[PDB]
């Protein structure tokens, strides 16, 4: 009954004659009627703070240049590789012959087989980019 009335940016607290208290520093409540304030995501070094933490809303974060987010809400950072590379466990390795990567993240993918759709290789592929199919 006395906790339902508590807004966001606040938690239910009936120890000390107050009905609700404000969320302590580096914590937040995004709903009202919360029994406990959730802890702010901290973001330094490789992680860069994009949205700062408020009393009522969590911080959001990306990865510094030369890195890219992996997983929901940038859970962990992964090293960028060059175009025509993939990230192996050994590190940034160049793509094998019949395969390309047009991005600075992810695996090498094989060139398109034009024959499948009936078309012919208009422009050849490379490590950096896919085949262009034609007739």
């Amino acid at each position: 009954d006395p906790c339902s009335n508590c807004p966001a940016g606040t938690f239910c607290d009936n120890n000390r004659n107050q009905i609700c208290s404000p969320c302590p520093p580096n914590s937040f409540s995004s709903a009202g009627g919360q029994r406990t304030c959730d802890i702010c995501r901290q973001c330094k070094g490789v992680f860069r703070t994009r949205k700062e933490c408020s009393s009522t809303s969590n911080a959001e974060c990306d990865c510094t240049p030369g890195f890219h987010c992996l997983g929901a809400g940038c859970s962990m950072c992964e090293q960028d590789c060059k175009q025509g590379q993939e990230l192996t466990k050994k590190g940034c390795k160049d793509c094998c012959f019949g395969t390309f990567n047009d991005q600075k993240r992810g695996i090498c993918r094989p060139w398109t087989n034009c024959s499948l759709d009936g078309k012919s290789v208009l422009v050849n592929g490379t490590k950096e980019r896919d085949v262009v199919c034609g007739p």
Binding site: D13, N14, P24, N26, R35, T36, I39
Partner: protein, 124 residues
């Protein structure tokens, strides 16, 4: 309804009201929608008396909330050294991570409780 009454009892810090509600067969591990047990609540608001009786009545010491925080995380964050110590003696997971991959030691440091962080770092 007995579970809801026990969470409020633990929150408000009413030692006798908890003892009665437990003795009336209330679920000691009663989660809310945020996965918050009586022990989390007691740990959050520094109610040692109630932390002790909830543990003695078979509270899950390593109960995780919806965002992965344990009673030790809360005690550590909220600067409740004696409750931190009691939870450790009751077999609390000292290197447990939350969703955001932060140990109670990290939360203690975040809230500037170096004293408590040192206790947690010595224990494994």
């Amino acid at each position: 309804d007995l579970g809801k009454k026990l969470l409020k009892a633990a929150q408000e810090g009413q030692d006798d009201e908890v003892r009665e509600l437990l003795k009336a067969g209330a679920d000691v591990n009663a989660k809310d929608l945020r996965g918050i047990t009586p022990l989390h609540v007691a740990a959050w608001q520094g109610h040692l008396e109630i932390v002790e009786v909830l543990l003695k009545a078979g509270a899950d010491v390593n109960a995780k909330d919806s965002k992965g925080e344990t009673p030790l995380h809360l005690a550590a964050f909220r600067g409740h050294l004696e409750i931190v110590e009691v939870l450790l003696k009751a077999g609390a997971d000292v290197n447990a991570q939350d969703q955001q991959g932060e140990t109670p030691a990290d939360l203690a440091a975040l809230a500037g409780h170096v004293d408590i962080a040192e206790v947690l770092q010595k224990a494994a």
